[PDB]
Structure 1
Amino acid sequence: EDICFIAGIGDTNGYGWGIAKELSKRNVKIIFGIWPPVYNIFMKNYKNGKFDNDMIIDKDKKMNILDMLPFDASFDTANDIDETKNNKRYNMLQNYTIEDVANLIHQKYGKINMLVHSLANAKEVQKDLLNTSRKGYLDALSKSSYSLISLCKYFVNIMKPQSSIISLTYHASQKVVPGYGGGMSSAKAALESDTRVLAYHLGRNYNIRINTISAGPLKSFIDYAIEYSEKYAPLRQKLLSTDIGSVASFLLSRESRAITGQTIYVDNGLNIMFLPD
């Protein structure tokens, strides 16, 4: 049976949740990686039932969450944590680096076969690119782009061949979105290019596929993008996290065995438009 690790979830309002919901329809067991400083809050809400309605799949089943672990996309191995290890919101948690999480999952449940990268972080997102600092820019690339490579590097060892990996990206990488600042656009451009390069390496070496989903806006600026999307997209339906979810589910399955290295647009077709009318 199938296990998917979803790295980067903090609530039920984002892409990771909708991806988890849809995979659950196929009886995929889900492991969530949750950013350590929001990990306890998430567990609290979880235990207090807050996510119960959100976990309902259909008349018969709820989401099968196999586990929830603290996961920090900033840290490749235990050797990379600087005071931080003993910071307020870190010191009651352990084994949350990328390598530690891979070891932990493998120790508890063996090999997995689906991997979802769903994280993005830029401390200076509100600053436009031209006014972004080196530190802010590199922090964005580290958390939002390198973390994909590191994820792949450490998880391939614990995946079955014919496994499949996806990440999330955004069209600001390819066309100008004023407001998507702080190097997030740069991060997405690097993420999309790396998906190809990773596709070559993982494909030839391991028979593992990797693709990325370029999603439309979901409020998880965003008010403008959502308004503009809903007014001008070819399809005028509301974009749902589960719309991204079902596409992810397909890319993560053997149904898409011949697709790799692609950026797939799931955005009601908004990306095809030039001139709004």
Structure 2
Amino acid sequence: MNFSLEGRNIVVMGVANKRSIAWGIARSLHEAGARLIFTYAGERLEKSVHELAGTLDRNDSIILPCDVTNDAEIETCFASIKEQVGVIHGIAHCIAFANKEELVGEYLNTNRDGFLLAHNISSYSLTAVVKAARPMMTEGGSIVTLTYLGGELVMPNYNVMGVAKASLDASVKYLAADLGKENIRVNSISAGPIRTLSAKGISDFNSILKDIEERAPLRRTTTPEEVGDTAAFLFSDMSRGITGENLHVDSGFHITARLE
């Protein structure tokens, strides 16, 4: 086996701009040879994502809308993919949302509507996309989602997104147990903090990143390319023994408890 993704069609869900973790993943996968299908939420991202995809050195990308709020766009999107490419070999699920005011101060700033919205977008959407993709994954495949340490432990302010990530992380395991008999693997990458659009609203994020640079074993914060290169492994056949796993790409921060 080898690391090449030539002849693999991979859906990358969640590019918003060039700082998106999904854009780090798309670059790594394209460099490995994959043909990419980008999905975006919101008509104003369409041109953005088309332009970023156009910087890739092959012009073979497909770009499609897919809001994951309910099933309707999911069905439209995956029908297009089925007609255009026939078979899907992977999905990178890079989607999260919660109401921003719930991600400041106490976790108890959430409420039922917000809690269920965060779980719908951040956790159920993986299952919804799996459901729509499964019958087109006829040649085996690999599904990767992104999680964060605040789904395992309390991270200040992460709040209802931590609870939704814990739901996502459990779903990765149950999906992996349903799909491995069809040679479909399901894993996550637990990325360290990265200054993306989804970092806007964190207080004193510069202090968080500085502390990671001091406390993490490798003495540096995570990049989208580190995350991308681990995702290229997970979509390749090199990782075929691995499913239901959560790989921390966080400079080792997960093994530490405090800064000396």
TM-score, normalising length: structure 2: 0.89
Q: Distance in 1 between matches of 2:74 and 2:106?
A: 30
Mapped pair 1:125 → 2:103: yes
Question: Does the Cα contact within 8 Å between 1:170 and 1:188 map onto a contact in 2?
Answer: yes
Q: Distance in 1 between matches of 2:67 and 2:82?
A: 17
SS of the residue 1:153 aligns to: helix
Could you say which residue in structure 1 is the equivalent of 2:133?
155
Could you say which residue in structure 1 is the equivalent of 2:89?
113
Percent identity over paired residues: 33
Could you say which residue in structure 1 is the equivalent of 2:222?
239
User: 142, 146, 150: which is aligned to 1:172?
Assistant: 150
Q: Distance in 1 between matches of 2:49 and 2:20?
A: 17
Could you say which residue in structure 1 is the equivalent of 2:245?
262
Q: Which amino acid aligns with 1:117?
A: H
Question: Does the Cα contact within 8 Å between 1:20 and 1:63 map onto a contact in 2?
Answer: no
Question: Does the Cα contact within 8 Å between 1:164 and 1:208 map onto a contact in 2?
Answer: yes
Deviation at 1:226, TM superposition (A): 1.6
Question: Cα deviations across residues 184-211 of structure 1 (Å, max 9, x unaligned)?
Answer: 001100111110011000112x120000
Could you say which residue in structure 2 is the equivalent of 1:224?
207
SS of the residue 2:92 aligns to: strand
User: 59, 66, 75: which is aligned to 2:70?
Assistant: 75
RMSD: 1.8
Which sits farther off after the overlay, 237-246 or 147-156? 237-246
Residues 1:190 and 1:213: Cα distance change in structure 2 (over 3 Å): same
Q: Distance in 1 between matches of 2:68 and 2:34?
A: 23
Residues 1:42 and 1:209: Cα distance change in structure 2 (over 3 Å): same
**For residues 193-232 of structure 1, what are the structure 2 equivalents within 5 Å?**
193-204=170-181, 206-220=182-196, 221=202, 222-232=205-215
Please, which runs of 5 or more residues in structure 2 have no aligned partner? Answer: 1-6, 197-201
Q: How many residues of Structure 1 are paired with residues of Structure 2 in the alignment?
A: 245
**For residues 136-155 of structure 1, what are the structure 2 equivalents within 5 Å?**
136-155=114-133
Please, which runs of 5 or more residues in structure 1 have no aligned partner? Answer: 57-61, 78-96
TM-score, normalising length: structure 1: 0.84
SS of the residue 1:160 aligns to: coil
Question: Does the Cα contact within 8 Å between 1:29 and 1:64 map onto a contact in 2?
Answer: no
Could you say which residue in structure 1 is the equivalent of 2:40?
34
Deviation at 1:6, TM superposition (A): 0.7
Deviation at 1:55, TM superposition (A): 3.5
**For residues 60-99 of structure 1, what are the structure 2 equivalents within 5 Å?**
62=57, 64-77=59-72, 97-99=73-75
Question: Cα deviations across residues 128-153 of structure 1 (Å, max 9, x unaligned)?
Answer: 32121110110000000000001111
User: After the TM superposition, which parts of structure 1 deviate over 4 Å for at least 4 consecutive aligned residues?
Assistant: none
Q: Which amino acid aligns with 1:269?
A: G
Q: Distance in 2 between matches of 1:224 and 1:76?
A: 39
Question: Cα deviations across residues 84-133 of structure 1 (Å, max 9, x unaligned)?
Answer: xxxxxxxxxxxxx1111111111112111011100010013335321211
SS of the residue 1:164 aligns to: strand
Deviation at 1:64, TM superposition (A): 4.7
Could you say which residue in structure 2 is the equivalent of 1:91?
none
SS of the residue 2:19 aligns to: coil
Q: Distance in 2 between matches of 1:219 and 1:64?
A: 28
